[PDB]
Structure 1
């Protein structure tokens, strides 16, 4: 009438639990999962002896273990993660030019170019759940990592994601504390004004795709009301993310790390990934295409960096 099972929220700290065989797992634990499979509606079987089941945090011990692994206090995070994992566990994660991509399914193209981008930039995540899942994503088992991204971004499978918003969500769970960016906006109604940015804001800019033009100076509307020019004074980061509203942009080999292109119907479009190696490669899910240059509606371009100091 009883079996011994183990319940967990992080698959690290296991918890011995006795369950009645006449009552389902849902009546005893609430929502319960056995390796991504929903077993809430199922009564415990003989073959479930000693197996490990995923459950939701419903006491002090499970909530603190879920907080130390996922770095979140959201009580619904694990459920939204299990809901996405039920789909991401079915996706194909082929190795494309040494990078782990995703075959297209349920508008996951923004997740693919984000996953392909993360494998080319230096970035260390703070939540242990994100670190462990990314390491496995490198090996072609990205089901846990994609379900975590969807949970952290609070997006469901099938929704159109934004690469810039997605990376921004991931950067806020990454160790970018030591990153620093120094900017200076020149004009005439103000003259000069220098600001310093730290963390996530130091590695992202919206308005220009060219990292070189960001150093030469871009024109922005300043509240002063003049022909204001913003230029990069100092950059201390392992990478930079340049983003802009989509227009026709020319990518050349060796001048960047990787980029993202957005095409199709704008409300519900499609993302592609362009990476720079010995030449330019376009990764569209599992499809690989190589060319010397690339012309298209680019939205995000990533560049490598260590320490920049302007000479102007």
Structure 2
């Protein structure tokens, strides 16, 4: 029998049927399933089991693969894998999606988004899982996302919360956003964001509107105008409270629709390819135009410098 924490460095161990896996190894999982209360079977010899990082070597390996120090991570990860592996991951419109189960609509929408933006995860667990998931095997990636976000299967989620959590574990250091807020009493004031903060915004969905200028409260009492001075990033995420919004073809990359409230709701994913495709888990519907309660819109960027002198 073998044990590991990353499924990359494996360790050979001893087969003894009298003691539960929990008494010999500690908490043990086989392909997600909690076998801690189980004693070893004759058919298990040679398989790979996961265990918690109790050995100092396993601590190091788990940190290098998952980029977290949380001891419970693996536990949570494995618990999530017990469900994500049962889900169906149909190909829909050239992307990997999830047939609806366990309120996963936010997860399916985040999954489709991740497959359409240029992102480079730093943790190897995530890089490996990402490439597997882009090809259709997305159980591990979804379990890892649930784990990194401290969400459980069935638990309610926000697509923006998920994307932001994950961006933290991505190489966005080269990203840069220069803004300029212009109040008529306070004057002009410029700011520069780098990293994760440069690729997200909250307040408006329209990126063209962010470039033209958006009204925001100022402390003096007036409304100030914030406009985008410079964007250096592979993508940009714009969020806003759900509202009826008209997605025009060729003007965005993809978008999150949300119907419902803080208690109960359902997420749909819209993407602009050669026309507007609406991916509701395993369901797909095409349309030339789309109007819906949008809350996230994702745009592609390379380098932008404002024309406002």
Question: In which range does the TM-score fall when normalised by the shorter chain?
Answer: over 0.9
Displacement of 1:303: 0.5
| Contact 2:31–2:82, Cα closer than 8 Å, also in 1 | no
Q: Select 1:95's aligned residue among 91, 97, 104.
A: 91
Displacement of 1:265: 4.3
Cα–Cα, structure 1 residues 182 and 291, in superposed 2: closer, same or farther, change >3 Å?
same
- What does the per-residue CA deviation read over 1:21-78, in whole Å, with 9 as the maximum and x for residues that have no partner? 1111111112111222222122112222222111111121111100000000000000
| Contact 1:247–1:297, Cα closer than 8 Å, also in 2 | yes
* Structure 1: tracts of 5 or more residues without a match: none
Q: Could you tell me which residue of structure 1 aligns to residue 108 of structure 2?
A: 112
Displacement of 1:151: 0.6
SS of residue matched to 1:278: coil
C-alpha distance in 2, partners of 1:238/1:275? 17
C-alpha distance in 1, partners of 2:42/2:102? 36
The TM-score with structure 2 as length reference comes to: 0.98
Stretches of 4+ aligned residues off by more than 4 angstroms:
none
Displacement of 1:20: 2.3
- What does the per-residue CA deviation read over 1:240-264, in whole Å, with 9 as the maximum and x for residues that have no partner? 0011111111001110000000003
| Contact 1:69–1:129, Cα closer than 8 Å, also in 2 | yes
- What does the per-residue CA deviation read over 1:125-178, in whole Å, with 9 as the maximum and x for residues that have no partner? 000000111111111111101111111110111111011111000100000000
Displacement of 1:19: 3.7
C-alpha distance in 2, partners of 1:264/1:197? 33
Q: Select 1:30's aligned residue among 14, 18, 26.
A: 26
C-alpha distance in 1, partners of 2:221/2:196? 28
The TM-score with structure 1 as length reference comes to: 0.97
C-alpha distance in 1, partners of 2:93/2:60? 40
1:157 paired to 2:153: yes
| Contact 1:189–1:225, Cα closer than 8 Å, also in 2 | no
C-alpha distance in 2, partners of 1:268/1:60? 43
C-alpha distance in 2, partners of 1:274/1:49? 47
| Contact 1:250–1:294, Cα closer than 8 Å, also in 2 | yes
* Structure 2: tracts of 5 or more residues without a match: none
C-alpha distance in 2, partners of 1:224/1:195? 19
Displacement of 1:225: 2.3
Q: Give the aligned CA root-mean-square deviation in angstroms.
A: 0.9
Displacement of 1:194: 0.1
C-alpha distance in 2, partners of 1:8/1:61? 10
C-alpha distance in 2, partners of 1:267/1:154? 18
C-alpha distance in 2, partners of 1:266/1:281? 26
Equivalent residue runs for 1:1-312 within 5 Å: 5-312=1-308
C-alpha distance in 2, partners of 1:232/1:111? 30
| Contact 1:19–1:28, Cα closer than 8 Å, also in 2 | no
Displacement of 1:224: 3.0
C-alpha distance in 2, partners of 1:46/1:231? 67
C-alpha distance in 2, partners of 1:199/1:224? 30
Q: Which moved more, 1:28-37 or 1:84-93?
A: 28-37
C-alpha distance in 2, partners of 1:198/1:224? 27
